[PDB]
Amino acid sequence: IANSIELITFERLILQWHLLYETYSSTKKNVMYPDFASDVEWMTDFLENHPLLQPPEDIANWCIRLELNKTTMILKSISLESIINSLRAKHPNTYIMHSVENTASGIPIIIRIYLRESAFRRSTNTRMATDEKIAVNVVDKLLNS
Amino acid sequence: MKICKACSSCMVRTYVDGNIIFRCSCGESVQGDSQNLLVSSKVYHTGEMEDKYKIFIKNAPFDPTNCQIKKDCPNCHLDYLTQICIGSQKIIILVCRCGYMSNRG
Amino acid sequence: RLLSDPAIQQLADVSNKDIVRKGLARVFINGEWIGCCTNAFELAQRYRMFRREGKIVHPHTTIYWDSMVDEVEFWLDVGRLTRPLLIVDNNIEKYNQACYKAAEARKKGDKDWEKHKIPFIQNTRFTSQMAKDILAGTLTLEDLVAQGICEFITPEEAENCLVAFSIIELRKHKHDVTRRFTHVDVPQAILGLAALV
Amino acid sequence: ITYGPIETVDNEELTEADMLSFISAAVNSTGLIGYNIKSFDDLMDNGIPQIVKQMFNESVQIQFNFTDVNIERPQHRNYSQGNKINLLPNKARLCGLSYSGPVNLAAEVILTAHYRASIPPFQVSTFPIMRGSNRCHTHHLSKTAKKEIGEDPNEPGGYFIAR
Amino acid sequence: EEINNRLLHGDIMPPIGLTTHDFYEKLQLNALKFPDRILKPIMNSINPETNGLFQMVATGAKGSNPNMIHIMAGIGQIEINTQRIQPQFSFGRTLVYYPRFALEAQAYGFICNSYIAGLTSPEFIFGEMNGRFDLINKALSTSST
Amino acid sequence: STKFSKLRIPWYLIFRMFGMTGDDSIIEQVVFDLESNSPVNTFMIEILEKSIHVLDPIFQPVQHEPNREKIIQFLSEKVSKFSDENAVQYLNERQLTILDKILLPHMGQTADTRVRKLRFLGL
Ligand SMILES: [Zn+2]
Ligand SMILES: [Zn+2]
């Protein structure tokens, strides 16, 4: 029970996060960061595996690429499915993508979260604010989920 | 650090129309290559930087106030080797004047 | 003297890129960055030897070598607390030479390498005769400092000193290559007159 | 300077009582109370000229420079109608007069005419003098001479007498 | 020394939520605590009937058992804020008398002597730190109260 | 000092006044290397960018000015609260001289040492 009740935030389930400023289209090839180019492979697999989950037409061109820490997942007994479900429930504006949940050694788990224009509806939500500040705020909210 | 060609000043990244454009106080805007897509980043397992102690470990054999140990040196065959305990992880590194370093150095 | 010294390189000659890449060491005097040096430890040791001789460098000048950063600092301002400390000498060079000779002997397979090695010895030049002379008034701290027996140490330089708190400690680790001491401290030195009452 | 081999140093018959001799020598060399008189002496000699020099300086212009400034010994004034007397600390305490000394100021002034004063050595005022310093008469005074002066020979000095 | 030897070989594996340094410090603090058996020799060298100090301590008139153990049979480990002597002198040093990253207990405030036996310079210095801390805390508490 | 008291002057302004022209060289004075890819260098360069781009509430008009003369003018306006070509030159030279006197006096007291001072400042 003590383990169950203790708060586990998303921030502690990742090794690194990169704000890439990229767009993904199921039919249109888009520019991608070089060192993260190979990512494309697993993304394709995800698209093949989940017919229902496909990129929306609302993508805002901002991407958050997260590397998950398998050791922490095993220690805390958190499955990737639970993380994805909770992230989607808490944050509906974002579009979630993940690699295979095999967790085999040598194949890190990568999660790509693409913002939608819903998060950018009124960039001047209170006062004139740029898109990248809004993206940073979304990242901060995501990590504290 | 994008540097304007006309002036050696920094360019801001506008992030307009999906393409990075480097604006300067004098104008002279420049397009952005795909290597410039990354907005920001953060790696949580920072630990202790290697440059954090690079110089200190380099100078450790010559520092009188450092602890010694009676283990032999594989390279130069000296009875004593300087022992350095660094980091909250308490990493023990054995070094010598000849250049031997137990930390894969 | 430092500017004329070959090791010291004037700021104009050196380049920030050279400093960062070639691993040069900044040299300061009273906080003024006068130049750069290739090896901080060698320069600090050489000027410490000069101070021990007492001709090139005044005995009351602080020489500090930082290891986390390669800077070397010389201080000569007022307000520096200073205290005399007996110098500890050793035969580490001879010990290293004997160790290398023993390693070569092992390589040759003769198996007398154990005989080649010599014991390590660290001691202080202070003797009972010097104590008797001091009590008789013949010898003074100036005479000791003129010789190599003792030298003045400041809190800045004390960061580079490993001090045995008493001669008993030095004798205990006399043949311990693991505990090479730089100085010996008389215990009563850690107390004032009122406390010593 | 080459030193004798450390292996030949014979000090095994050394005891903490013997090591107390080093403390005795250190205290004798430095002294119980020091560097207050020394700090004052460097002030008086070099620092005062140093600071006054640091304070150099239809538009008539007259700057003020202090190239030369000479302090003097106490020189008790108006004693028996006498400008100069060998003011002794005991007299300063008993009478209550400050144990200070005249300060003479002589220099030259720059002359500028955009659109200079000549001063002989004069005593602007007197400056407090620490007892036991070079200016004080007690310096270079024997203990019997200290008693003849009236000061306690055992006193180490280093305190001003004023008010 | 056994704990230190474990440290050299890297055997110390701290538990969850504790760094290696913190676990090592806790282990060293626990290992250096005096046993109750320390009172056996003390009670063997004193006659309760004719011992003024013991009669004063036991009857509650003055003193305490720790005072007796410090006067005779050793002061033991010095603790400040339930912590050993932290390396304030320099990076990895606690005093000018010990090397950088010293491993012996004596370098961090362990006193093997008693007040009657006599304290060496480092032991006296550590005791001085502890006593001055007690005084400073008392003054601060008085002011705040 | 009495002059420039309670004035929070951005560092790159100080660098530009004394002779530094390019931002690349200004960042070099602090990092000592732009080619190096050590994490310390990258993090420091990021901080220095953030300091360059941020706009100080005072010195904002002068912030982006390429001419150091104009920078010395803005500073002189701030301190002053306490032929023109010769007047601009005279006032700018005097202000630069007084800053050379009050900025790192131990490093030097003459304009010749200005570059050295800059290096030290960067350090
Ligand atoms: Zn430009
Ligand atoms: Zn070696």
Please report which helix (H) or strand (E) contains residue C75, including its range. Answer: strand C72-75
Method used to obtain the model: cryo-EM
Question: Among C48, C185, C188, which would you mutate to test the D interface (most chain D Cβ atoms within 10 Å of its Cβ)?
Answer: C188
* B10 Cα–ligand 1 center, Å: 7
DSSP letter string, D42-74: HIIIIIHHHHHHHT---EEEE-----EEEE---
* F24 Cα–ligand 1 center, Å: 12
Which 3 state secondary structure label does DSSP give B95?
A: strand
Q: Which of F55, F57, F52, F97 is nearest to F76 (CA)?
A: F97
E12, E42 Cβ separation under 8 angstroms: no
Q: Output the six-digit token pair for F65.
A: 């000015």
B45, B26 Cβ separation under 8 angstroms: no
C-alpha–C-alpha distance, residues A36 and A38, integer Å: 6
* F66 Cα–ligand 1 center, Å: 10
End-to-end CA distance of chain E: give it in Å, rounded. Answer: 44
Would you call D23 and C186 a contact, using CB atoms and an 8 Å cutoff? yes
Q: Output the six-digit token pair for D101.
A: 């000394």
Which 3 state secondary structure label does DSSP give C132?
A: helix
Q: Which of A24, A107, A23, A116 is nearest to A67 (CA)?
A: A107
B29, B21 Cβ separation under 8 angstroms: yes
Overall residue count recorded for chain A in this entry? 145
Which 3 state secondary structure label does DSSP give D32?
A: coil
Q: Which of A110, A123, A113, A93 is nearest to A24 (CA)?
A: A113
Q: Which ligand is nearest to the CA of B94?
A: 2
D19, C186 Cβ separation under 8 angstroms: yes
Contacts 24+ apart (CB under 8 A), D41-47: D41/D133, D41/D134, D44/D71, D44/D133, D44/D134, D44/D135, D45/D134
C-alpha–C-alpha distance, residues D51 and D46, integer Å: 9
Taking residue D79's Cβ as centre, other Cβ atoms within 10 Å add up to 15
C-alpha–C-alpha distance, residues E105 and E112, integer Å: 10
D157, D37 Cβ separation under 8 angstroms: yes
Residue type present at position A52: L
Would you call C178 and B68 a contact, using CB atoms and an 8 Å cutoff? yes
Q: Which of B35, B41, B36 is nearest to B12 (CA)?
A: B36
C-alpha–C-alpha distance, residues A84 and A64, integer Å: 14
Rg (CA), chain E: 18
Would you call E7 and B68 a contact, using CB atoms and an 8 Å cutoff? no
The distance from CA F11 to its chain's CA centroid, rounded to whole angstroms, is 5
Q: For the CA atoms of A22, A28, A32, A37, what is the dihedral angle to 10 degrees? A: 130
B64 touches chain C (CB under 8 A): yes
| Residue in the structure block whose two tokens are 């370098």 | E107
Overall residue count recorded for chain D in this entry? 163
E90, C161 Cβ separation under 8 angstroms: no
E interface toward B at CB cutoff 8 Å?
7-8, 10, 12, 19-22, 24, 90-93, 99-103
Out of A15, A18, A21, whose CB is closest to B15?
A21
Helices (H) and strands (E) in chain E — how many of each?
Answer: 6, 2
DSSP letter string, C148-174: TSEEEE-TTGGGG--EESSHHHHHHTT
C-alpha–C-alpha distance, residues F35 and F23, integer Å: 15
Q: Which of A111, A117, A100, A112 is nearest to A56 (CA)?
A: A117
C41, B62 Cβ separation under 8 angstroms: yes
C153 bridge partner residues:
C83
Question: Among B1, B12, B51, which would you mutate to test the F interface (most chain F Cβ atoms within 10 Å of its Cβ)?
Answer: B1
Contacts of C114 (CB under 8 A, 6+ apart): C102
Q: Which of D102, D108, D101, D139 is nearest to D122 (CA)?
A: D102
B76 touches chain F (CB under 8 A): no
C-alpha–C-alpha distance, residues D51 and E105, integer Å: 54
Q: For the CA atoms of F37, F40, F44, F46, what is the dihedral angle to 10 degrees? A: 60
C-alpha–C-alpha distance, residues A18 and C183, integer Å: 54
Ion ligand 1 neighbours, Cβ < 5 Å: B 4, 6-7, 9, 24, 26, 28
Q: Which ligand is nearest to the CA of F23?
A: 1
Taking residue A64's Cβ as centre, other Cβ atoms within 10 Å add up to 20
Q: Which of F123, F116, F85, F95 is nearest to F20 (CA)?
A: F116
C-alpha–C-alpha distance, residues A66 and A19, integer Å: 9
C-alpha–C-alpha distance, residues F123 and F117, integer Å: 10
Contacts of C61 (CB under 8 A, 6+ apart): C51, C74, C75, C76
End-to-end CA distance of chain A: give it in Å, rounded. Answer: 21
Q: What are phi and psi of C175, to 5 degrees?
A: -110, 40
Residue E80 DSSP label: B
Helices (H) and strands (E) in chain C — how many of each?
Answer: 8, 10
Out of E20, E21, E101, whose CB is closest to B83?
E101
C95, C120 Cβ separation under 8 angstroms: yes
Taking CA–CA distances from B74, the nearest residue in chain C reads C103
Question: Which CA distances in Å does D9 have to A131, C69, C121, C129, C177?
Answer: 78, 37, 10, 12, 18
Q: What are phi and psi of E44, to 5 degrees?
A: -85, -20
Which 3 state secondary structure label does DSSP give D92?
A: helix
Dihedral sign, CA of B10, F58, F47, F28? positive
A31, A91 Cβ separation under 8 angstroms: no
Q: What are phi and psi of C158, to 5 degrees?
A: -65, -15
Contacts 24+ apart (CB under 8 A), B92-97: B92/E7, B92/E8, B92/E10, B93/B57, B94/B69, B95/B57, B95/B60, B95/B61, B96/B61, B97/B61, B97/B62
C-alpha–C-alpha distance, residues D100 and B25, integer Å: 66
Interchain touch E–F (≥3 Cβ pairs closer than 8 Å) = no
Would you call B69 and C178 a contact, using CB atoms and an 8 Å cutoff? yes
Which 3 state secondary structure label does DSSP give C59?
A: coil
Question: Among B23, B39, B41, B45, which would you mutate to test the A interface (most chain A Cβ atoms within 10 Å of its Cβ)?
Answer: B39
Residues of chain C with C-beta less than 8 angstroms from the C-beta of E121: 165-166, 185, 187, 190
Q: Output the six-digit token pair for C31.
A: 């906080």
Q: Which of E125, D149, E110, E31 is nearest to C187 (CA)?
A: E125
Question: Which CA distances in Å does B81 have to B70, B93, C161?
Answer: 6, 10, 19
Q: Which of E114, E105, E124, E127 is nearest to E73 (CA)?
A: E114
Residue type present at position A21: Y
The distance from CA A3 to its chain's CA centroid, rounded to whole angstroms, is 26
Residues of chain F with C-beta less than 8 angstroms from the C-beta of C18: none
Q: Which ligand is nearest to the CA of B2?
A: 1
B47 bridge partner residues:
none
Residues of chain C with C-beta less than 8 angstroms from the C-beta of F106: 30-32
C-alpha–C-alpha distance, residues D19 and B65, integer Å: 24
Burial of F81 (0-12, 13-18, 19+ CB in 10 A): exposed
Q: Which ligand is nearest to the CA of B9?
A: 1
| Side-chain-side CA neighbours of residue A46 (13 Å) | 22
B82 bridge partner residues:
B68, B95
Q: Output the six-digit token pair for C22.
A: 């070639």
Question: Among B2, B7, B10, which would you mutate to test the F interface (most chain F Cβ atoms within 10 Å of its Cβ)?
Answer: B10
Taking residue A14's Cβ as centre, other Cβ atoms within 10 Å add up to 20
C-alpha–C-alpha distance, residues F116 and F123, integer Å: 11
Contacts of E107 (CB under 8 A, 6+ apart): E94, E95, E98, E122
Contacts of F73 (CB under 8 A, 6+ apart): F62, F88, F91, F92
Residues of chain B with C-beta less than 8 angstroms from the C-beta of F21: 8
C-alpha–C-alpha distance, residues F29 and F117, integer Å: 11
Q: Which of D44, D46, D68, D72 is nearest to D56 (CA)?
A: D68
Q: Give a three-class secondary structure readout of chain A.
A: CHHHHCCCCHHHHEEEEEECCCCCCCCCCCCCCCCCHHHHHHHHHHHHHCCCCCCCCCEEEEEEEEEECHHHHHHHCCCHHHHHHHHHHHCCCCEEEECCCCCCCCCCCEEEEEEEHHHHCCCCCCCCCCHHHHHHHHHHHHHCC
